[PDB]
């Protein structure tokens, strides 16, 4: 009956020439780069690392309750209003720089880049190894939260023995604020796929490194998870290393380059095969101000999908990764006594701190939706919460009923009147953690007064009135 | 499928050729 | 420096076959050495209970996962098979006519 | 502020170990209402991590004994080598790469036609501030002196 | 028109042989070396990048 | 007389549906478009390709 | 990145500007004497190219 074939927002969402500016004052966060400091439960210093997803959930004021002076341009009997994102800027405050991560007890046996002689094996051959991760910048903007992908442990079709390889599955999830980006060790669930707990650095050893699923996010029907994205990523292999442990899969005894069997029987030292489980340390090379995605205005003229920047539900999700400002600052405190004249290593407590700084600025265009029967059916099939949020659907089905209102409710001559049951049950995205930014009291029509606003005015021609 | 705009490549092909789907 | 995740519009081919998918077949040959991340995963199979790290304990494995998604835009073309076109197609590849009719 | 944040006095090289390293507040200078603090700017920054080191000292926050310590999680308590963790306070040695004549910001005329803010180049108060950093000509010349006499062979 | 989608993150994987035929490093050798039976070594490398 | 439901109908199809470690054959319950003649045996004749 | 050898012309002042404190390695039998703080780099004009 109603329709098929998802149509562009440009067919039922009519723009106006009213543009508003909205921005955040300045968003700072200070933490530890590797792990959250707790006492035993309450977080004393959170984990703030330069390799996290920053997923900002922006809240817009409902444009249907805006008190415009002459409202004669829209009819609230048959029309409703929405915000459309037209300009954005993701400001970034810290200097450029590269921070490193490591593990005090990393599962690395040797260096196999160039071995001067053949090697050995004992118990606990773990080493203290640090590395700079892959360089990554990305920005995604949409009205729904982003989708990320990672490889995880699946249930096998039969039972296995103790120590067998876990089967892989590609698992889609929402990307949340504080999720780790891929760092060059892949998109994988380190908590479940590596029971060693020593296979990758400390900031990811128990995390799930996720990558944005661009393939599923562009190929969704309405195009709401992202309507713009930019990305830059670079990596090279810095050093080439070996694992230690019981070899789970042996090398096949047949050599396919020569078509023969091979064993080091003639050489006593090489008879026990060295580990063929290799890993490289990643390295994101030279960071540059020329390569920068951020601190630039982006004008969203034509979206990638059928949602041409329409901020349905008065919500917007801004997902940022910036591995270009991951400088971890090394703090030290003089403990015990501020009196010694000689350096001791026991006299100073070393600490690590990371500080991020963001500033977000947007240009929103007001748009009007005239809610005819087919437009109502199409919006209802697309998303019912749109026509619930905007008073119009759910015309009132029942009639009145007596509640009998017992005068003395706390007396023992009547039955118990307790009822009062419902706590508020609204938020469907409550299980997810985002950097919630409130822009309800931050909308302004004076574009000239703001840096992105006057950039938008200059780009569109539109000089201020004299 | 002949409904080109429904898919990411198909609406990229339409945007490239002009050829926009008729607004209903 | 990526070649992939981009649409490529075949406006004109290199040779005399201007994109014609003879026999209802198309070959797509991809090599991509920029996503060759081998995921090193271990298991605690010989190690339920121990609170001290041992090497005999953990079994190490290697895995790799590829992901592809191929999208195309095909155009319908018609060929009117006269004596000259039929003989020319038979000279090019007899299997084309043997698969159709004529 | 290296002076008040690092009482070790040995965490960064001599020229900055007692100083304050500042970055220009582009976000604040741009969002100033009149646009007077800057009306034109440029920048070229670059760095790579050259070497990766540790810090010696008493550990301030111990690594938690769960999956937050990574490889140092699984305590090597059975092994006399790795019972006590190495310091997990890593610092990278920076390196600004190859300086080139092509990438030079300076020795080029700039024409201030349209400023960033509302102040379009008006030098209020008969005054102007020009802020320059040029780390591409930072070569320190080595001098020597033959103090004990040029006489001996 | 055609498009080849690629889903995984970017990255370089390395491979090697546990018993690779190398005798010595010749990029910079301090002095003359030696040789015997089975001088094979465990050696890994990143391959040529190709798309 | 049916619009697309707001959920979508993206199916997740594995290429090797008999392998261990992928959860199930995934399609045990016959929810959608089962004729009530499931309980009856007929000489089923397909003429789809015979018109 | 190298050092120079010779008598110190100007010694490092007794105060450490990063920590705001005086410093000396008088508690150790190695660092009691400062190493020469006269550093010099060796230049390198990289790849010469025909373009």
Numbering used by the authors:
A (entry chain B): 17 to 482
B (entry chain F): 460 to 483
C (entry chain F): 307 to 408
D (entry chain C): 205 to 357
E (entry chain F): 103 to 153
F (entry chain A): 409 to 459
G (entry chain D): 256 to 306
Task: Quote the authors verbatim.
Papillomavirus is a T = 7d icosahedral, double stranded DNA virus with a genome of ~8 kb.
The subparticle refinements were recombined into an icosahedral capsid with 3.3 Å resolution overall (ISECC_Recombine), a dramatic improvement over the original 4.4 Å map. The high resolution of the recombined map allowed for the full asymmetric unit of MmuPV1 to be built for the first time. The L1 protein structure was reliably visualized from Thr16–Ala481. The build of the L1 protein revealed the typical papillomavirus secondary structure elements of BIDG and CHEF anti-parallel beta strands making up the L1 core within each capsomer. Each copy of L1 has a C-terminal loop region spanning Trp 406–Trp 451 and five of these connecting arms extend from each capsomer, independent of whether the capsomer is in the hexavalent or pentavalent icosahedral environment. Each of these loop regions extends to interact with a neighboring capsomer and these interactions are stabilized by a disulfide bond between Cys 432 of the connecting arm and Cys 173 of the neighboring capsomer. The resolution of the map density for the connecting arms ranged from 3.3–3.8 Å with some spots of weak density suggesting that the connecting arms are flexible.
